[PDB]
Design a binder for this molecule. Structure first.
Ligand SMILES: COC1=C(OC)C(=O)C(CC=C(C)C)=C(C)C1=O
Length: 386
């Protein structure tokens, strides 16, 4: 009957004593948690001076009882069922190509405040490594790869040069209503360049430009299909571009923005489709991938904590991986192995295989001169709907 304790907001207190290759430290956390909404705010402060490890490495160690378990998963919250007596949480965090954390936490209720006292032991770490070297950036949630935008710039520039190769070698001149599709693809390519300059801010500017240039591409190619599929009016005379005054792209680079020739004329048609029909699908593919990237951003930064039952020890086990963003683009794998056991003798809910969707944002207090870390977490349970 511990779920009734987490209705509303309850205070949190976190203390951590750690020792990593002899370097000792202490962290004191304070804040509040809301299990009904799946959030919790905390402000951790290092009390021994300067922290010898990056703050993101301690986030997983520094209270899964504040998870937003839906009503169809209420009988799977092992954390709340152990309260107020509490539970013990031991982990083994294996950092790839580096050391290994081994923690022992005691999460329980002390009257009205949820207390989590942890002992940490770091071993086999390297001073030149990404842990003891503080080479991990603060906001660790996504790799922010640069070669991904450059690869989209390749497939965008390849189509551009292929279009010019069709026109200047195969002697198939472009149409007017067509040519605008070159600008739309050029806007997609340009978005790939700004996005690849400094992706680790400003990427959103490149993404909306990519979103816009692809949507303009599906608009122009749609009109390009209807003119080429339906009976040509035959009386609507030919066309030329009408670029803006400040941007005479036909006057600046005439061999790319030409429009000598007009639409409503089937130039290429292969594999049962026309030239505007293939570009319509390409721009739709560009727009779909652009939409997928936007919808990915919320769930791109969250890690899943997969949980199984351990009825032999009347507890649970949990495995999950965490990739920390190293400075200069590298990745640091943190392999986690969790093991929870109740403290009290009251019965606990042994859950089926489910996972906890956890997303964390790290910030700073502009008026705190100590080594600190402001924390906010989003914990929601998901998995089998039964
Ligand atoms: C020479 O005719 C033309 C092409 O070659 C088939 C194009 O690829 C394109 C644009 C291609 C893409 C992928 C937007 C245009 C606008 C064009 O007029």
């Amino acid at each position: 009957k511990g779920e009734e304790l987490f209705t509303g907001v309850v205070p949190i207190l976190v203390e951590l004593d750690g020792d990593v290759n002899g370097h000792k430290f202490s962290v004191r956390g304070e804040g509040e948690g809301d299990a009904t909404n799946g959030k919790l705010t905390l402000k951790f402060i290092c009390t021994t001076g300067k922290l010898p490890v990056p703050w993101p490495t301690l986030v997983t160690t520094l209270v899964q009882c504040f998870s937003r378990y839906p009503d169809h998963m209420k009988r799977h919250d092992f954390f709340k069922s152990a309260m107020p007596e509490g539970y013990v949480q031991e982990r083994t965090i294996s950092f790839k190509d580096d050391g290994t954390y081994k923690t022992r936490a005691e999460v329980k209720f002390e009257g009205d405040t949820l207390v989590n006292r942890i002992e940490l032991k770091g071993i086999d770490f390297k001073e030149d490594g990404n842990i003891l070297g503080h080479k991990l950036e603060y906001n660790n949630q996504a790799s922010q790869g640069r070669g991904a935008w450059l690869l989209m710039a390749f497939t965008a520039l390849a189509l551009e040069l292929t279009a010019l190769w069709f026109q200047h070698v195969m002697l198939l001149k472009p149409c007017v209503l067509c040519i605008y599709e070159r600008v739309a693809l050029f806007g997609v390519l340009g978005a790939a360049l700004i996005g690849a300059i400094a992706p680790k801010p400003l990427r959103y500017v490149a993404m909306v430009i990519w979103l816009y240039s692809a949507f303009r591409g599906v608009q122009l190619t749609y009109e390009h299909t209807m003119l080429q599929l339906y009976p040509s009016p035959f009386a609507t005379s030919d066309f030329m571009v009408r670029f803006p005054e400040w941007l005479p792209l036909d006057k600046w680079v005439p061999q790319v923005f030409v429009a000598s020739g007009d639409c409503a004329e089937r130039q290429w048609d292969f594999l049962g489709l026309e030239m505007p029909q293939w570009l319509l699908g390409i721009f739709i593919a560009y727009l779909i991938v652009a939409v997928l990237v936007v919808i990915s951003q919320p769930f791109k930064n969250s890690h899943n904590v997969y949980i199984t039952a351990d009825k032999q020890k009347n507890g649970i086990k949990a495995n999950f991986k965490i990739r920390h963003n190293v400075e200069d683009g590298s990745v640091q794998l943190a392999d986690h192995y969790q093991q929870n056991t109740p403290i009290g003798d009251g019965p606990v809910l042994l859950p089926d295989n489910h996972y906890l969707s956890t997303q964390s944002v790290l910030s700073k207090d502009p008026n705190e001169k100590r080594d600190h870390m402001v924390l906010l977490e989003f914990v929601t349970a998901a998995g089998i709907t039964h």
